[PDB]
Amino acid sequence: IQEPPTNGKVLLKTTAGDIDIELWSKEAPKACRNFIQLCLEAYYDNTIFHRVVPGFIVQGGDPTGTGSGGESIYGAPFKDEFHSRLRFNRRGLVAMANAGSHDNGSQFFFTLGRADELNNKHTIFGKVTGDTVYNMLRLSEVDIDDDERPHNPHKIKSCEVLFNPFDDIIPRE
Known part of the structure; x- marks a missing residue:
């Protein structure tokens, strides 16, 4: 009845403010490696948060912005990494779409509430710090047109890896 410590940290500089993410790299090494490397490759620069479901999730990480694109660093979609100590029991969690x-x-999403129904279906790989959760929540404070798409989506402008727990990440050219 206590969350495992995190190891790794990433700052997303968004149009809603700074969002600091602590990573569960021990529990979800593949997802955390993917995320860190994509950040370092500037892959997430100028990508929008294309999907908002109020009280549930805000989703982004698609370089095309359409909601159907995006690729991992491994050359094909990669495996799920679940862990019984990591559950969708509160808002402010970071998981793979x-x-x-x-x-x-x-593509990845932030939780705006509980999402118990996603347990054992989506990889949880991080959590947003207390002093940036208001900025995370502000990503969802948007007028939503059709198909859960904001009229004026918020964006990731740039990323900073404040702590890389991996030895051997070489960003692709």
């Missing part, structure tokens, strides 16, 4: 099993690419 997918459309089925073993379908992790680049």
